[PDB]
Paper text:
NSR is a member of the S41 protease family, specifically the C-terminal processing peptidases (CTPs). NSR from L. lactis TS1640 has been shown to degrade nisin by cleaving the peptide bond between MeLan28 in ring E and Ser29. In this study, we report the first structure of a nisin resistance protein, NSR from S. agalactiae COH1 (SaNSR). The present study reveals that the lanthionine ring E of nisin determines substrate specificity of the nisin resistance protein (NSR) and contributes to the coordination of the nisin cleavage site at the catalytic center.
We deleted this N-terminal transmembrane helix and included a His8-tag for purification purposes, resulting in soluble expression of SaNSR. SaNSR protein was crystallized and cubic crystals were obtained that diffracted up to 2.2 Å resolution. We solved the structure by Single Anomalous Dispersion (SAD) phasing, using crystals of selenomethionine-substituted protein (data and refinement statistics are shown in Table 1). The asymmetric unit contained four copies of SaNSR that were virtually identical (root mean square deviation (RMSD) between the monomers = 0.15–0.5 Å over 300 amino acids). A SaNSR monomer consists of eleven helices (α1-α11) and eleven β-strands (βa-βk), which form three domains: an N-terminal helical bundle and two protease subdomains. Altogether, these domains form a hydrophobic tunnel of ~10 Å width, which could very well harbor the nisin molecule. The protease core domain is formed by six strands βb-βg and five helices α5-α9. It contains the highly conserved TASSAEM region that harbors the previously identified catalytically active serine at position 23622. N-pep is predominantly bound to SaNSR via direct backbone interactions to amino acids 167NNTGGN172 of β-strand βd, which is part of the protease core domain and is structurally located on the opposite site of the TASSAEM sequence motif. The presence of N-pep within the tunnel is clearly an induced artifact of the crystallization procedure, since in the full-length SaNSR protein, another 30 amino acids are attached at the N-terminus of the N-pep sequence that form a transmembrane helix. Out of all residues of this helix, only the side chain of Asp110 is intruding into the tunnel, which neither forms an interaction to N-pep in the crystal structure nor in the NSRTail MD simulations. This suggests that the protease cap is not adopting a fully closed state, rather an intermediate state.
Author numbering: 31 to 317
Write the structure that this text describes.
């Protein structure tokens, strides 16, 4: 077809990332920020490729956005997509299901609907009186299939809040979740009410942590295990010219109860190295 393309220079490509970082990053203002930015622009003047430009702005991204921010090359983004897994369950006994809820980074509608659908089926069509939700080793990815699959046990209300560098406070509610895309019905939201035990470990991160926050303060819920990884900030992701992605931190976070998080670990209710064990016992007492 009839195509016109005049791709940015490697310098331009680098400067585009600096503009975004400055525009939305939590920390990208003030004396230390320029200097880092100025130093980055000086190197970019002689950059000879996009890859080189990403290397050059790395300090700026890390400073301007913090430890939850980064630039992923197109290749890195795809390899990470291929690490995606689907939820699994095992019946522990006639009353308790153990549900494994893993990392998934996929965007495509089919994959994310298979992930959420698997969860939906377990929660809606299986028999139980209590649940164990296992977020160990879930380092995040696409929030949509995670929150979506768990829709039946979450409020049709505020999930968590987040505030940007300009002091704009916003809210992620069950409505902001594209359930329609997963072909899941809003009539199923919050229709299961059983004791829920949630397990986390040190690797539990990011989307998984914000999924964890979405259960906080629920009276039927209690959590076991260890503090999470501490990537409790909202990111916005910007697709760059060659398919690379800028993941940029733009929001500080608070849960329904008013507690604030800024790349800070979440404490489970009951810290322990035996959370499956203590989980079941807790579930027994409440059943």
């Amino acid at each position: 077809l009839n195509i016109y393309l005049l791709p940015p220079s490697s310098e331009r490509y680098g400067r585009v990332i600096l503009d975004r970082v400055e525009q939305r990053g939590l920390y990208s203002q003030g004396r230390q920020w320029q200097i880092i930015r100025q130093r980055s622009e000086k190197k970019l003047k002689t950059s000879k490729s996009y890859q080189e430009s990403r290397n050059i702005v790395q300090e700026a991204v890390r400073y301007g956005g913090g430890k939850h921010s980064q630039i992923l090359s197109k290749e890195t983004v795809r390899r990470d997509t291929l690490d995606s897994r689907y939820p699994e369950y095992r019946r522990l006994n006639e009353d308790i299901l153990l549900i494994t809820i893993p990392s998934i980074s996929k965007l495509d509608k089919r994959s994310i609907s298979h992930y959420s659908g698997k969860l939906q089926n377990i929660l809606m069509e299986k028999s139980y009186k209590g649940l164990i939700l296992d977020l160990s080793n879930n380092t995040g990815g696409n929030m949509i299939p995670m929150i979506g699959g768990l829709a039946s046990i979450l409020p049709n209300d505020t999930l968590f809040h987040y505030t940007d560098k300009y002091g704009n406070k916003k809210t992620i509610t069950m409505k902001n979740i594209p359930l329609e895309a997963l072909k899941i019905s809003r009539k199923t939201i919050n229709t299961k009410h059983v004791p829920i035990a949630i397990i986390t470990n040190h690797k539990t991160a990011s989307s998984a942590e914000m999924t964890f926050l979405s259960f906080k303060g629920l009276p039927n819920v209690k959590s076991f295990g260890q503090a999470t990884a501490g990537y409790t900030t909202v990111n916005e992701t910007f697709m760059l010219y060659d398919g690379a992605r800028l993941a940029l931190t733009t929001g500080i976070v608070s849960d329904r109860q008013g507690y604030k998080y800024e790349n800070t670990p979440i404490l489970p209710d009951q810290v322990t190295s035996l959370p499956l064990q203590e989980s079941q016992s807790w579930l027994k007492s409440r059943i």
